[PDB]
């Protein structure tokens, strides 16, 4: 009675509007897509009376599935509305990233674990229990629900592309169990290679060219000297974000009992995920040893 806990599934913010959060939980970096993950129905479980007054388990699990399908269905529609109803790679990737995060929430292997997410975790603890075999029971429940949730996320494209529908987003890929940190490095990298050309483009309009072929515009010119300070802000953040994500990866990779074909370091994930990735170019970029920062920002 006004005591009802509720987290609304609001419109998705413009891509890269809010950067990766490396401050909230300092061991990890959270993407704004994850913070905005639709959890309306999962969160609502805190308010459900002890309907245990006349129920058991198999039922609880089924209730959970129906509620999770609804949150996944909303997420799918809102993500499509974010990509401006364009049924492309960008959308498929988000469906993969978000499907993945629902799985980690259920498995109790998610890295947000704060506020409403701590509330969703406690809700799942109430359904499944807290014994040693509770986490596997959860993992099992996920392995029997994971494809239904992906088909639930795709409902929006299906309903909107009636019969004029193709499988641009493949099941086998989206429903593939991978560690959270691996999936987020894939998402971060993708965001990075988008931010980067823009960031070099603004640094160029103010700094490319010499004061009669001899002297850099970054030496005596303030509009440029400024562009360098602001590009430095961005590259400083991405470097921090990278080192944080990289460390988490190292920790997780060791704990993991499952071998990932080809994945040895975080660099291997980007080389896998991104088209034409070069780790020497990346390493130089994040460490201000790139052609652009030297040629446009140092005297």
């Amino acid at each position, epitope marked *: 009675s006004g005591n009802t806990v509720m987290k609304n599934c609001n419109y998705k913010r413009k891509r890269r509007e809010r950067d990766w959060d490396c401050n909230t939980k300092k061991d990890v970096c959270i993407p704004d897509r994850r913070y905005q993950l639709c959890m309306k129905e999962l969160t609502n479980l805190v308010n459900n009376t002890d309907t245990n007054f006349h129920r058991d388990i198999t039922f609880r699990k089924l209730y959970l599935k129906r509620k999770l399908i609804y949150d996944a269905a909303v997420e799918g529609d809102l993500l499509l509305k974010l990509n401006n109803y364009r049924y492309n790679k960008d959308f498929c990737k988000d469906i993969r990233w978000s499907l993945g995060d629902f799985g980690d929430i259920i498995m109790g292997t998610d890295m947000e674990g704060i506020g409403y997410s701590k509330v969703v975790e406690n809700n799942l603890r109430s359904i499944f229990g807290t014994d040693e075999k509770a986490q596997q029971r959860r993992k099992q429940w996920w392995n029997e629900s994971k494809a239904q949730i992906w088909t639930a996320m795709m409902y929006s494209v299906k309903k909107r592309l009636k019969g004029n529908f193709i499988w641009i987003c493949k099941l086998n890929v989206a429903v593939n169990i991978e560690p959270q940190i691996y999936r987020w490095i894939r998402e971060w990298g993708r965001d990075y290679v988008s931010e980067l*050309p823009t960031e*070099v483009q603004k640094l*160029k309009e103010k700094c*490319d060219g010499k004061i009669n072929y001899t002297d850099k515009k970054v030496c005596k010119v303030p509009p440029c000297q400024n562009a360098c300070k602001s590009y430095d802000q961005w590259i400083t953040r991405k470097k921090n974000q990278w080192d944080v994500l990289s460390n988490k990866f190292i920790s997780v990779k060791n704990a993991e009992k499952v071998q990932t074909a080809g994945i*040895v*370091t975080p*660099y*291997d994930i980007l*080389k896998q995920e991104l088209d*034409e990735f*070069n*780790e*020497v*170019a990346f*390493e*130089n*970029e994040i460490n201000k*040893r*790139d*052609g*652009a920062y*030297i*040629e446009l920002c140092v005297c």
Partner: antibody
Amino acid sequence: EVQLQESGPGLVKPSETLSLTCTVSGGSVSSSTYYWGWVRQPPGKGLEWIGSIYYSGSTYYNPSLKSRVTISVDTSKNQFSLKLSSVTAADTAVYYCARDGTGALDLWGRGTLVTVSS
Amino acid sequence: DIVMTQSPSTLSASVGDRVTITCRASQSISSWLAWYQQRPGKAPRLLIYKASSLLSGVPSRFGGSGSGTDFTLTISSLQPDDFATYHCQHYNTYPWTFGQGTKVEIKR
């Protein structure tokens, strides 16, 4: 799949100018992050860095050759070139073009042998 | 100008053997060292950058160690296609300079 290929005569008479060009395929030479360079390997000798260029035009040379070396960039043709003047038999070597990652040469060309002879 | 000194100039090991090459710098390089593999009839390839980072794609047997003046390339288990000449290179400051190279030969 970025790839590098050198082209140019394999025979130069002494005192004449040595020209070679590298041509970038599978990507652009207009890289905002990489430099493009030349490396030499004289017979029975170690590797020597000749110089590198950024697509903007900014050039870096080895004092060892700075006297008679010039490296150009044709962003239009997706190429970069080497010109080493007044050659001697000390300039007979295998010439490689490489992608210069501010010191880490992460992609090389196959190399071309230039023999200085009359 | 900095001077790079590789030791030995040549070495012979058997397949499966642990082999180590060293690169000694004249001045101190802050671990700005690159290691290249030149196999016969092949262009040099980058194996290791920043003294110890193993480039993605190159075999797991290659390991780089060191900082300052003394560096080591280590091949944990020699293979027939490891018959090549290995070159070290600094990138601390212009000009970039290479060591003379170490020829690795396979006992059979």
